[PDB]
Paper text:
Microtubule (MT) filaments, composed of α/β-tubulin dimers, are fundamental to cellular architecture, function and organismal development. They are nucleated from MT organizing centers by the evolutionarily conserved γ-tubulin ring complex (γTuRC). S. cerevisiae γTuRC is built from a helical repeat of seven ‘V’-shaped copies of the tetrameric γ-tubulin small complex (γTuSC), composed of Spc97/GCP2 (SPB component 97/γ-tubulin complex 2) and Spc98/GCP3 subunits each bound to a γ-tubulin molecule. Here we used cryo-electron tomography to determine the structure of the native γTuRC capping the minus end of a MT in the context of enriched budding yeast spindles.
S. cerevisiae Spc98 has a structured N-terminal α-helical domain (Spc98NHD), as predicted by AlphaFold2, not visible in the inactive recombinant yeast γTuSC filaments. We determined a crystal structure of the Spc98NHD at 1.9 Å resolution, revealing a compact α-helical bundle nearly identical to the AlphaFold2 prediction. Interestingly, S. cerevisiae Spc98NHD is more compact than the extended GCP3NHD/GCP6NHD folds alone and thus more similar in size and fold to half of the composite Mzt1-GCP3NHD/GCP6NHD structures. This observation could explain the absence of Mzt1 in budding yeast as Spc98NHD is more compact and its structure by itself makes up for the lack of Mzt1. The γTuRC luminal bridge density can in principle accommodate a trimer of the Spc98NHD crystal structure, in agreement with an AlphaFold2 prediction of a trimeric Spc98NHD oligomer (head-to-tail). Additionally, we observe densities connecting the N-terminal base of Spc98 and the luminal γTuRC density, consistent with our preliminary annotation of the luminal bridge as a trimer of Spc98NHD. It is likely that the other four Spc98NHD domains are not bound in the γTuRC lumen, and are averaged out due to the flexible linker between Spc98GRIP1 and Spc98NHD, similar to γTuRC in higher eukaryotes. Consistent with our model, deletion of Spc98NHD in S. cerevisiae impaired cell growth under stress and reduced γTuRC oligomerization propensity in vitro. In budding yeast, however, there is no Mzt1 homolog, nor nuclear actin, and we propose that the luminal density corresponds to an oligomer of the compact Spc98NHD helical bundle.
Numbering used by the authors: 0 to 95
The structure:
């Protein structure tokens, strides 16, 4: 029953309330899933993606931590190589 893009949308908003606008969080989720479903992952395109959004963001201790939780959440996600394990991982973060 879990579908990937709205699940990620919900988790990111729970990690980082109000950090991104609705429109930008959706664009971010779409770019994340595009990288996640790419055939072969090269280097670490994920961190550069996140760094790009972080340039547009606020310096404050709250938002710094929000971005750290996002990048650790996504780093582990991009380590998961099969779908049932991914569902399990996401279902854990759905408690937040």
């Amino acid at each position: 029953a879990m579908e990937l893009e709205p699940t990620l949308f919900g988790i990111i908003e729970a990690l980082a309330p109000q950090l991104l606008s609705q429109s930008h969080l959706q664009t971010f989720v779409s770019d994340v899933v595009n990288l996640l479903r790419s055939s072969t992952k090269s280097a670490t395109q994920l961190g550069p993606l996140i760094d790009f959004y972080k340039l547009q963001s606020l310096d404050s201790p709250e938002t710094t931590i929000m971005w750290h939780k996002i990048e650790k959440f996504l780093d582990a996600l991009f380590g998961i190589q099969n779908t049932d394990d991914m569902v399990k991982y996401l279902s854990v973060f759905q408690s937040l």
